[PDB]
Amino acid sequence: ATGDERFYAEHLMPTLQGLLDPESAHRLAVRFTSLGLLPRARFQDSDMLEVRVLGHKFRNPVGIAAGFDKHGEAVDGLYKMGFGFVEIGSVTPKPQEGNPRPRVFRLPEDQAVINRYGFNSHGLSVVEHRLRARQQKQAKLTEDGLPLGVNLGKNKTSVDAAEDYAEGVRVLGPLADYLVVNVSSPNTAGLRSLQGKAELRRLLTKVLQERDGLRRVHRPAVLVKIAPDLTSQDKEDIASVVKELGIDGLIVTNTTVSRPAGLQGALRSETGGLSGKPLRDLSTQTIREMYALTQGRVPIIGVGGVSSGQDALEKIRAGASLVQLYTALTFWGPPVVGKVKRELEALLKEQGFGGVTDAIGADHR
Numbered sequence: 001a002t003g004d005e006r007f008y009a010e011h012l013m014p015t016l017q018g019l020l021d022p023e024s025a026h027r028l029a030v031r032f033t034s035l036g037l038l039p040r041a042r043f044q045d046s047d048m049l050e051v052r053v054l055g056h057k058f059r060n061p062v063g064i065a066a067g068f069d070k071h072g073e074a075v076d077g078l079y080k081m082g083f084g085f086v087e088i089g090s091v092t093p094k095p096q097e098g099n100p101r102p103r104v105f106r107l108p109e110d111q112a113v114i115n116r117y118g119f120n121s122h123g124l125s126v127v128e129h130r131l132r133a134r135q136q137k138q139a140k141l142t143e144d145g146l147p148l149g150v151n152l153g154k155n156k157t158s159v160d161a162a163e164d165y166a167e168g169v170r171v172l173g174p175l176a177d178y179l180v181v182n183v184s185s186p187n188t189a190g191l192r193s194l195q196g197k198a199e200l201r202r203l204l205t206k207v208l209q210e211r212d213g214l215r216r217v218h219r220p221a222v223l224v225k226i227a228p229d230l231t232s233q234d235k236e237d238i239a240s241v242v243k244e245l246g247i248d249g250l251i252v253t254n255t256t257v258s259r260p261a262g263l264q265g266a267l268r269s270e271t272g273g274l275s276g277k278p279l280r281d282l283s284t285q286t287i288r289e290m291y292a293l294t295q296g297r298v299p300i301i302g303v304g305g306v307s308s309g310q311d312a313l314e315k316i317r318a319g320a321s322l323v324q325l326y327t328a329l330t331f332w333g334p335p336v337v338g339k340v341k342r343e344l345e346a347l348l349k350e351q352g353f354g355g356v357t358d359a360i361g362a363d364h365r
């Protein structure tokens with residue numbers, strides 16, 4: 001463990017958390033990240049951590065989850081922090097304010113957060129112009145193994161969810177290495193309930209037709225991001241549609257609307273999605289199920305409660321090719337990224353894996 005890891009985890013982040021409400025702390029974290037005001041990434045990525053998936057090289061398998069950089073303001077700072085890939089968004093077609101404040105709550109005793117932001121978004125046109133300003137810088141980053149994902153949402157008052165996603169594909173698809181469609185924010189009325197199988201097939205058919213219409217250099221992979229709260233029937237139906245349509249991958253999982261027994265935080269009964277440690281094993285088990293139902297042929301990005309190398313390797317062994325985190329960064333600060341990478345490399349060696357690739361889905365064998 002480094003000097004920075006202990007200083008951020010034991011002293012700086014708890015002190016800042018004592019001074020700032022979580023939304024103010026997030027806004028300051030995005031601004032500092034955007035300005036490069038972040039500790040030196042002392043972890044040189046080894047060859048063991050390189051992954052080839054979704055038509056791209058990934059220098060390391062640890063990404064920043066959607067929601068940290070909703071509006072594409074801090075992408076370059078996030079690579080500087082040591083992430084192997086960045087996902088921005090969710091981005092909605094039109095700008096929207098999201099829910100009234102307060103709308104995010106820390107559960108420090110649980111190493112958890114509850115959020116109900118409600119897709120606050122600068123909208124597609126603002127994010128398009130932001131990504132255009134650094135499009136060729138991003139082309140070089142992607143070529144050097146640091147890809148960019150864009151997570152697409154829908155407006156609260158949309159009368160045609162599939163058309164909102166199609167607009168996102170047309171506008172930001174040409175600027176993305178991969179696109180994500182949520183069947184899964186807990187904080188918009190109707191999004192998770194297009195699990196109705198024929199309706200999911202109709203939505204994803206439209207999204208894939210729009211993606212296929214882009215020029216080859218500008219044609220991203222398309223992934224579906226799912227909730228951890230799906231029925232067995234919902235998971236069977238998603239696996240079926242994903243294989244039928246040739247969806248490129250899955251992101252498993254979003255936040256949970258469940259409240260696991262044992263939460264201690266005073267704010268545990270706030271409305272919203274729960275993230276961090278209490279989500280971890282529900283997310284790992286969802287990865288394991290989706291990997292089996294897709295016969296290991298559909299790349300999975302594993303997300304929920306990753307804050308250590310062990311957490312990352314458990315999701316990789318369950319079937320994830322890549323992992324993401326958000327809530328750990330909230331609690332432990334920037335040093336957590338190097339921590340996860342160092343711990344994951346050590347555990348791969350301890351368990352006899354030549355690299356990340358050899359560990360993907362190892363538990364199923």
Ligand SMILES: NCC(=O)Nc1ccc(-n2nc(C(F)(F)F)cc2-c2ccc3c(ccc4ccccc43)c2)cc1
Nearest residue numbers: 012016029030032033036037038039040329330333334
């Ligand atoms: N050339 C190196 C350099 O300028 N380093 C630097 C390191 C820390 C800070 N910094 N200074 C403060 C304070 F309190 F003194 F003003 C706070 C931090 C800090 C604290 C937490 C985060 C970040 C940056 C991002 C971030 C993202 C996710 C969560 C927490 C934070 C920066 C500023 C600069």
Ligand SMILES: Cc1cc2nc3c(=O)[nH]c(=O)nc-3n(C[C@H](O)[C@H](O)[C@H](O)COP(=O)(O)O)c2cc1C
Nearest residue numbers: 065066067089090115254275276304305325326327
């Ligand atoms: C404050 C907050 C905002 C989020 N916003 C989004 C979003 O806009 N789109 C999305 O797909 N996921 C969003 N997520 C979910 C994360 O991408 C991730 O799936 C989830 O938080 C689990 O990872 P974690 O336990 O490492 O935070 C958000 C999560 C948090 C905590």
Ligand SMILES: O=C(O)c1cc(=O)[nH]c(=O)[nH]1
Nearest residue numbers: 117118119185187255273
């Ligand atoms: O904007 C939000 O409220 C949000 C979106 C999402 O997909 N997940 C989440 O936990 N919150």
